[PDB]
Amino acid sequence: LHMIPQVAHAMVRAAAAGRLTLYTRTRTETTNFDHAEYVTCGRYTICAFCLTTLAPHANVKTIQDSHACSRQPNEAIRSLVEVSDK
Amino acid sequence: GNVQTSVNTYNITGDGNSFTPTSDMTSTAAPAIDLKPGVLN
Amino acid sequence: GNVQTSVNTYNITGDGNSFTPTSDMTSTAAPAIDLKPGVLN
Amino acid sequence: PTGKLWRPVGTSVATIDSLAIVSDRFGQYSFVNEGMRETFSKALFDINMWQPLFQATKTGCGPIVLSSFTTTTSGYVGATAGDALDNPVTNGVFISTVQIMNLQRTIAARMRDVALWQKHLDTAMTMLTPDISAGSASCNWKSLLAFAKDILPLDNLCLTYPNEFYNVAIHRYPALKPGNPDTKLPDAQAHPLGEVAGAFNAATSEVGSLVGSSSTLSQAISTMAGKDLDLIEADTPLPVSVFTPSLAPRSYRPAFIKPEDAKWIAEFNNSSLIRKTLTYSGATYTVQLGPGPTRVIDMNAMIDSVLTLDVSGTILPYDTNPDLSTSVPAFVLIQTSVPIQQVTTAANITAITVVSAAGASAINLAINVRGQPRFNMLHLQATFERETITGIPYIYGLGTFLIPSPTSSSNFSNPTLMDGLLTVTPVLLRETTYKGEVVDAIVPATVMANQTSEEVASALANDAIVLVSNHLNKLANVVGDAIPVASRTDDSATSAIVSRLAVQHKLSQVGQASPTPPDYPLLWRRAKRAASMFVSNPSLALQVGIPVLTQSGMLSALTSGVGTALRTGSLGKGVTDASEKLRARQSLTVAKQAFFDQIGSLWP
Amino acid sequence: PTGKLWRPVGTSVATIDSLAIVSDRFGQYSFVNEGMRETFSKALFDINMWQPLFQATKTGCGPIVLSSFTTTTSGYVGATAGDALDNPVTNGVFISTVQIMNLQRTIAARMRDVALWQKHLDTAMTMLTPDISAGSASCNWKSLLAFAKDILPLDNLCLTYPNEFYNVAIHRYPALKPGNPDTKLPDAQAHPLGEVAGAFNAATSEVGSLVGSSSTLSQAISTMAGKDLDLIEADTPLPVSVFTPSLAPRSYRPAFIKPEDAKWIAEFNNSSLIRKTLTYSGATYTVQLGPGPTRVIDMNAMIDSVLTLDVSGTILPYDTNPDLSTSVPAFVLIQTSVPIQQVTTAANITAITVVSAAGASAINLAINVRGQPRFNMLHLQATFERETITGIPYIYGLGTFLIPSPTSSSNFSNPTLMDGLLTVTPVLLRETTYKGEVVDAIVPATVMANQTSEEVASALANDAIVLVSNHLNKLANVVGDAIPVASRTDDSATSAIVSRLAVQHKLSQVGQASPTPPDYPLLWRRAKRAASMFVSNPSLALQVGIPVLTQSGMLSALTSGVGTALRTGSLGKGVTDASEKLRARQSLTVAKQAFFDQIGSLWP
Amino acid sequence: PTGKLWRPVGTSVATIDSLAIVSDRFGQYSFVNEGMRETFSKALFDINMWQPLFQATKTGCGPIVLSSFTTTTSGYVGATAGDALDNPVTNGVFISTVQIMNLQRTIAARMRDVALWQKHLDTAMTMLTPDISAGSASCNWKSLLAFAKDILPLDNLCLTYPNEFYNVAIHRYPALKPGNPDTKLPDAQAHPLGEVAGAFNAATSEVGSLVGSSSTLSQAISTMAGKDLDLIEADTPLPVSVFTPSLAPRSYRPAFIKPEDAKWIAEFNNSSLIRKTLTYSGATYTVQLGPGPTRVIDMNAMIDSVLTLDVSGTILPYDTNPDLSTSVPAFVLIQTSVPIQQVTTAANITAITVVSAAGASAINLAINVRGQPRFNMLHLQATFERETITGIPYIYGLGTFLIPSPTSSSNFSNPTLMDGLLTVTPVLLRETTYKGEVVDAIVPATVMANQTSEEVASALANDAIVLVSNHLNKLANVVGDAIPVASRTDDSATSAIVSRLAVQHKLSQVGQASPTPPDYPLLWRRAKRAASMFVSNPSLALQVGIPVLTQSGMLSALTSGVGTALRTGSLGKGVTDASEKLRARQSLTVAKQAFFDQIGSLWP
Ligand SMILES: *C(=O)CCCCCCCCCCCCC
Ligand SMILES: *C(=O)CCCCCCCCCCCCC
């Protein structure tokens, strides 16, 4: 089973105060969501394409994954971060 | 305990039966039969 | 899988072989051979 | 017969003295009784099997017939002239010593040879689970092969001899059925050399698995007779040895354990403070025995152990009372004149020995972990010995602080480092401890429902309680394991107890209106949770106030039931829930068939 | 044949009814099948051995021939008239009941006799390690003897009969080779009565030790079939019984466990405080539910256990808020109207029962341990029962404080004593718990990679998770033990997994450019650490987010591999690292030879 | 002979390659060697027993004779043409494959049938402990019956067939002696089908129980050869595999472990604070490395594991320094340029990676538990991998805080969350760790008396120490179990050691006045506690400063003693304290006789 809603409760609390960030496929952080795949808190990591939990540790530099897809609303948590980043 | 008669050589309510454990004969059937690969062949 | 021919009664790539487990015959040899002092003699 | 063969050295007339082990240039011929040939044949049989791989690789040396190591001598064969006289064997089959050497080093040399190949055959065989346990399931051979042609790493031995390993394999996996040469089709039946053994291991749907259910029983039977679960609540002195106490070093947290909850630990419950002094390594320090009661390990009732009081992660407030810092924490014995719990002031404390101090004051042993400086994990540690405290009526082990200068700041501190995790390890098993006394024998039944909730968890490593707990624990795994004390099957265990409750509740009803005819549906169910609560937490049966379990009957009862219960399991004990167990196995074979289906497509 | 012997009571014609157990004045003759003579001979053989010590000490009574307890009757021998009819045995060897009694009490009486001497012989024999396992090593006999002439304590029996024990000994230790009388020199070969057995135990340098490697396998095979490791990740309802849960009482630390991390524990997350009241023993106390969320044990989803909340060593700040002191700490149930996590204020809490209070306020339970007064180790404790909470939708167990008078001081305290180490012990195995519900069957595969890091460590004693952990743990010791999942030998275990990764990664490549031909050297190595990570920490396979291990295939796969893997080990499985293992044994014999060299000099 | 039977193909004489298995349509005849008939007879024998219940309930189908599944073929019977040629058997008894199928599914079908009834017979039999172990004890039959007429729940099967179960029973319980028809009196002797087996299980008063004492020995012998207890203190490289390390994930409490007490954990002992920064998820946080030394897990010397630092119940003072709140606690690696313990200020720390942060600041992770807000139990967790740290000379794992804005308040705090219970789990068994280095082999003898008190308890999950502890622990249970190292019996174990102390103390006396002739009564007793202290706490033998136990001789010595000691126990090893053990059994039978006396009155 995907996520385990204890994970999603850590998504919103990391997005209420925006900490998250968006990592791309080349393991670099961006803030645009278009090139980004990995989503952190930094407790849990989720690739935005397949939308499954990957590693409870962050530093997505040490994560192995094989997925490839496009279009992923919710952008709403991504939108809630930049409002709460102020 | 109703009388039977021949089905089996002993009646349960039969005459002069006797429950009486003896430290000497510890009641036991056959549980530990060996069947493991090497030991059964 | 190159053809052999006589070394052993069966070719591996031989005609009509068939991998097919049956819950009935659990493959397996002889591992549990008893050798402990009392039991081997 | 058995043993070495003997022959009349004095000739003809063979008496109980005219015999003599027939030794000679080959060593001594020892008889090879029927069953002992089963082994050496079963061992050689498992080697001959690998015949096709021995020739392929030019090792080996032909098939090993056990008839090459024996002989056909004849004489009397026993263990001693006296008894060998009653075993006249003619043309028996004996193996000479020097032979008992080869059949040994041959089976050993060959065993290596095969052990190796046999390992390669495997990484390839199990590398496609050739074993299901419900119904069948094939996997078109072409694919299968063309598949392993991949996976198998370049250093196996199943790639260098495919059908040289295959022929060995066919005899070990009744999954691989070779296609018959003159009809070019399988065989339905699979004929692996382990024909019978492999037939009797299949998870037979009627009852789990004979090989399983059989052992899980003989296994339990072993324990039941072994440790001495029988006699588990015997009411009479028993040498601690009878409890085979081993690997038994329990750890605590004193300065918390109430004195009445565990005799081996008394406390200085006195009004004011009791600052004493002692020249330790020149410097004069002051043991405190501060504001609170300061529970100290009593020395009597303390089986010469290896006390190792660890003081780590525990608070060390040298920040506030500066008095605390500078004082080297140290485990110290304290001999008092008047018995503790009656020792009021300093003049009462005979002497104080620093049995083990910690070099360096309390400001190097610290380590800040968010304000509250903790203790860098360190282990102070005495080696108390029964007799080093001979005569000495009162003496206590105390892991205190040894302040180099008592002050007003440390007037409400109380430097007992006992809040640390102390770990006593009985270093002399023969002697146990009970209710505060050191003994050599326990009285099992006495320790049942005689401890309190915590007069158990506060037990002292290798003391009756801890022994009458290590014991129940074995008996608890025999029932938990063999007997079905975890289903509505009113098993032999919960049944032995029910008969006690009846006989018990029945006489308590005798005399007086007997207005209540015994229940039974309620008794069966009450005893079911009683036997169940036992398997669950074996310990409980020691605590005063546990329903059923703590009446003298039970346990003494239970075990002797569980006892005979194991000695009759039959073989098909596995019939229990052998329905869902079966349905679960079919569930797996359906999913594994699903796997073979992909192996079958991807690699066509 | 087997069983008691029968004979045609009706004479001549023996039908399935004209038979009858041939009983009589001696009891009933039971047949002594070939193998059953092996035992009684092997037992008597081990006694005859001690012949030289029986005469020396005038006990015993001559050598015990098994042919003195049997007879040579003939008839039909079976278990019942019906089946005994198919075993006509002529002049078979049967032992009558009254005889089966002596061969018993004789082997028993003699067994004591020898068991004693045999113990003296030993304290002297092993008292000079007569057993090496690589190459040889002597120790000039004179010295050796003249040495033990010392060591051996004055109450042995090897000093009263030297060459009366020596003759017994020579047959048990192929180390002591007696000097032949007519050439006055040793023999090279050593001929101890255990000729074969002792030959087959030597640590053969080709492969560790047949007696070892053989058992370590049959041992693992037992478990594999026994507990039911097979079917370990079966996807379908399985009675808890199928998991033989025993001796299973896990302890925690709630008031810390997040509610979502373990369904059996909800919290009162409400704005202000919720001071309620309750007349307990006359006196009126106020349960607090203070400032923080106060996590409480939920009652539903709580398998009628034995909750025993221990409160010790934990802080007790009666020093600051005086409000805290005077309040008797006590475990109390709390039935709320509206569901908790929706219970705002006092009027919401239906009632509150003090299921177990602690006599004496919070100022006697204390004990100063450096300022911060702790809690004298004490155990409060309910005995929750499934149905005592029937209907009652909302009810929670809370180990709070029961303040005799709430004040401003306790306005930020929150008296939850749950920070203490609570220990629930399921007292009724049949019923398990999963995801918050009580059930009678688990669905294994469901519990895999379904818990989170701590949705495992926070499991409730005897709940699916804790059961699907106790299970993997057995299977984890079968691989850890038998299979070599701890060397670069790409064993049967890490091999079963590799085949899954391939078949898996291979179809995920099907459809689309297939630009990546499967790896294999990388797959073998990835599955090696997968099988290895399992043996390591069996638990992990339950946590969501574990590489390989948590895909549905594996495990279901692994086990069924490891399964067949054990059923083929051969005997010489010990060939693994049997090189360094050998070289280490020679290392020991070289050091032990060094010992004999001193025994040889010091005592010349 | 053994294996399938073979006759040659071409005909005439059978020359290898002229012999093929004599496959038949039914299947291949496999030979039924003498012993293998013992099993199938012993299995069928246990079924025939239930004859009276098969007829009663019209199931079954007559008694199962094993002679119905076999045949009397003749030919050569081996495992392969080559070796089968040396086993010419005439009219041997073989069972064809298709038959090996029925004898299987019959014994399986019948096994279910009986397994069921056999369960009912039991809940009724054991429901009155028909087994005592000292002297006798009756219970007038009338009462007994009229009693069970009650207890037995309405769904048994012993109420529907009383003397249809009774007849089955009489053959399993030599307690129930049926009254003979033509003298209407018992029989004294009891003749249950298990005549012999039941005779040899009785707890014989001379020596505990042969079935027990026998197994407790063979059991220990298994281990001794298995794990490889032998070679326990071998002085030479040994593959970690040789230690079968499994299910091995140990947990700690760093930020307390001194750096010198365990190489895998260095500390930043620097003067001031070392506030660094790092953009983590956009937001910039400051790692602190506060006032104290902040012990951090070193990365090198850290076997690629699964580090899971739990931070719960531990204090979280966001109340005072508000600086602490708002900061998401998180495990973070720290690569430093200059080696730690030489890293002074921020410019020294190369980089800092947040390997696993906790979503949500430190004010949601809290939970008030009496003023002192604790940490809601949560597990941060990296997955360190040997090579992800290649080259990188200095790097450390640190479970710190990540403050979003350092302040004056957090100037004495030091946010190391390491005070939490970290649990490393080696995820790759093949590689061990010793003294700070990662290796593939240990040198046992090296790890003895080489660790300090706590250089052991601070060991790192699956490191030499933890391996050379898991090993001694097995050997510790073999002695604890089999050998009597817990009584004044100067056993084989404490005896092997005594001989070392002598040979040792004897040469230390050589050269110089030799004023002290070796003691012995004092040596025996000193070595007794040495062997005893070992069985007690196996670990100790690793700590520098343990009397006797830590000299190179012992252990290497001990084991090889204990070794041969088990290989001679006899059978009657149980003679030890078989006196009080006996007297305790009579004690139970006297109390159980007391029970039967009530069953006898209440239900007249
Ligand atoms: C008639 O069936 C009355 C009940 C008497 C016997 C019923 C079963 C209880 C006794 C068992 C006898 C067989 C072995 C326990
Ligand atoms: C030729 O060798 C091509 C490869 C086909 C077989 C190689 C080994 C893999 C199959 C094993 C068959 C024997 C038992 C697994």
Side-chain angles (χ1 to χ4, degrees), chain D residues 60-81:
Chain D
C61 44
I64 311 157
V65 191
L66 180 44
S67 66
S68 95
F69 298 106
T70 56
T71 77
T72 298
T73 332
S74 32
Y76 296 109
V77 49
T80 98

Side-chain angles (χ1 to χ4, degrees), chain F residues 91 248 506:
Chain F
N91 287 306
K506 219 291 193 310

Side-chain angles (χ1 to χ4, degrees), chain D residues 338-367:
Chain D
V338 153
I340 193 175
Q341 290 162 42
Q342 172 141 345
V343 37
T344 293
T345 60
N348 231 172
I349 300 180
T350 296
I352 292 188
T353 292
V354 176
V355 76
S356 185
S361 63
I363 191 182
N364 186 209
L365 284 37
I367 158 199

Side-chain angles (χ1 to χ4, degrees), chain F residues 292-304:
Chain F
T294 35
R295 319 215 179 306
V296 295
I297 293 166
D298 217 329
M299 302 293 67
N300 300 320
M302 246 291 107
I303 43 168
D304 47 7

Side-chain angles (χ1 to χ4, degrees), chain D residues 531-597:
Chain D
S532 179
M533 178 177 267
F534 172 86
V535 167
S536 186
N537 177 59
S539 175
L540 279 195
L542 304 194
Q543 306 166 48
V544 189
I546 274 307
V548 186
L549 267 194
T550 60
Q551 293 177 290
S552 57
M554 284 52 98
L555 289 163
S556 195
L558 159 85
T559 65
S560 80
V562 179
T564 90
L566 304 194
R567 271 168 285 124
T568 25
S570 250
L571 210 105
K573 172 204 100 169
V575 72
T576 310
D577 301 289
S579 171
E580 300 180 0
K581 200 193 313 302
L582 193 203
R583 188 274 319 301
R585 281 206 200 71
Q586 274 155 307
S587 167
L588 292 182
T589 181
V590 149
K592 171 173 302 172
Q593 169 51 194
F595 162 52
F596 291 147
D597 288 307

Side-chain angles (χ1 to χ4, degrees), chain E residues 185-285 287-443:
Chain E
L185 228 44
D187 225 350
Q189 306 310 312
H191 321 288
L193 263 306
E195 199 83 277
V196 188
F200 279 95
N201 288 319
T204 43
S205 64
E206 292 38 277
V207 288
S209 165
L210 315 191
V211 63
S213 60
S214 94
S215 71
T216 169
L217 264 169
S218 59
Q219 165 38 53
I221 298 184
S222 304
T223 319
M224 273 309 240
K227 282 65 173 264
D228 222 358
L229 266 8
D230 152 54
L231 127 177
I232 154 170
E233 189 180 296
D235 219 311
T236 114
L238 293 148
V240 176
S241 69
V242 179
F243 292 94
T244 46
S246 56
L247 173 37
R250 287 152 49 55
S251 70
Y252 320 112
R253 275 260 167 133
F256 281 152
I257 307 163
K258 268 184 293 172
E260 94 269 36
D261 289 322
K263 288 292 183 177
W264 63 274
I265 170 183
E267 47 132 19
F268 289 106
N269 46 115
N270 61 290
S271 292
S272 62
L273 343 181
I274 315 177
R275 302 183 190 187
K276 191 70 170 57
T277 25
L278 76 187
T279 285
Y280 160 70
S281 64
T284 294
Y285 302 109
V287 176
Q288 240 264 157
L289 284 69
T294 35
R295 319 215 179 306
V296 295
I297 293 166
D298 217 329
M299 302 293 67
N300 300 320
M302 246 292 107
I303 43 168
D304 47 7
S305 54
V306 188
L307 270 100
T308 177
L309 169 54
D310 153 287
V311 188
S312 83
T314 244
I315 273 299
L316 170 60
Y318 67 180
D319 71 293
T320 50
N321 65 301
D323 191 359
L324 196 57
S325 177
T326 306
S327 72
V328 304
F331 186 74
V332 351
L333 262 73
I334 296 179
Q335 172 178 3
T336 44
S337 299
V338 153
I340 193 175
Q341 290 162 41
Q342 172 141 345
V343 37
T344 293
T345 60
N348 231 172
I349 300 179
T350 296
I352 292 188
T353 292
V354 176
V355 76
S356 185
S361 63
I363 191 182
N364 186 209
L365 284 37
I367 158 199
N368 185 96
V369 182
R370 285 173 303 187
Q372 267 180 310
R374 312 288 197 178
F375 256 49
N376 256 171
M377 215 246 357
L378 78 113
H379 297 178
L380 347 163
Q381 75 186 355
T383 301
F384 175 66
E385 295 303 309
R386 269 254 75 42
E387 91 186 357
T388 69
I389 271 183
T390 311
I392 297 208
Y394 320 110
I395 180 168
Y396 314 87
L398 205 196
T400 187
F401 239 92
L402 284 160
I403 312 187
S405 52
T407 300
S408 301
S409 51
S410 291
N411 247 294
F412 325 81
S413 287
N414 190 132
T416 171
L417 287 188
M418 300 300 260
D419 66 328
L421 193 161
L422 148 79
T423 310
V424 31
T425 49
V427 60
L428 191 269
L429 287 259
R430 41 187 309 293
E431 292 207 311
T432 191
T433 296
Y434 195 51
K435 292 296 182 176
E437 279 80 305
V438 182
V439 201
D440 282 281
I442 311 165
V443 183

